[PDB]
Amino acid sequence: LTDTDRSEDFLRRVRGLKAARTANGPRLYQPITLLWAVGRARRGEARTLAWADTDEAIGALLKRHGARGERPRPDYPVLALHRAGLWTLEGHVGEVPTAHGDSALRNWFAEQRPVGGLAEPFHDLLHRSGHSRVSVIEALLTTYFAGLDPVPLLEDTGLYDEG
DNA sequence: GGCGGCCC
DNA sequence: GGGCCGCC
């Protein structure tokens, strides 16, 4: 195996992601979100986290490392990663919205304030398997950071040695 | 038209 | 709250 079974399923969901495009490349919301979660999985940090702390932590990485003009709005990639089955959200009424729109996304997180994080099987996988971490880091760097310097982001996520 | 997103 | 773009 389930490590090999889960790793292949994990990497398949990551490769199926469809990020929004700028003129010169895909926007960095989803890879920055994922690498934040990968670092947390590696160090065994709390998988399930309150939205206020998740929003602030991802937002700070968006501000510092948003090399294609990203806004500090983690609501976009979190919703997209949830739809892909990579992210869990708990404590909300009704259905989770898609990452389409703007104000409705912010208002939904402000009202529902869901608790969540990377899905439990993938968090556990990346905590246990250094090979799975290296695999997804390389794949995300290949897809999203062509012509960009990922080193400051890797050190801010605690993944410099593995990336 | 849907979904990931920016601009008002 | 809205319209709209890129890509599917």
Author numbering: 3 to 165
Q: How is this structure described in the published paper?
A:
The sulfur atom of phosphorothioated DNA (PT-DNA) is coordinated by a surface cavity in the conserved sulfur-binding domain (SBD) of type IV restriction enzymes. The sulfur modification-dependent REases SprMcrA and ScoMcrA use an SBD to recognize the DNA backbone phosphorothioate link of the RP stereoisomer, which is adopted by the naturally occurring PT modifications in five DNA core sequence contexts in prokaryotes. By contrast, the SBD of the PT-dependent restriction endonuclease (REase) SprMcrA from Streptomyces pristinaespiralis has a relatively relaxed sequence specificity, targeting GPSGCC, GPSAAC and GPSATC, but not GPSTTC or CPSCA. The sulfur atom of the PT linkage was inserted into a cavity which formed by Y31, Q32, Y78, P79 and A82 through Van der Waals interactions; the phosphate groups flanking the PT linkage formed electrostatic bonds with R29, R73 and R85, as well as hydrogen bonds with Y31 and A101.
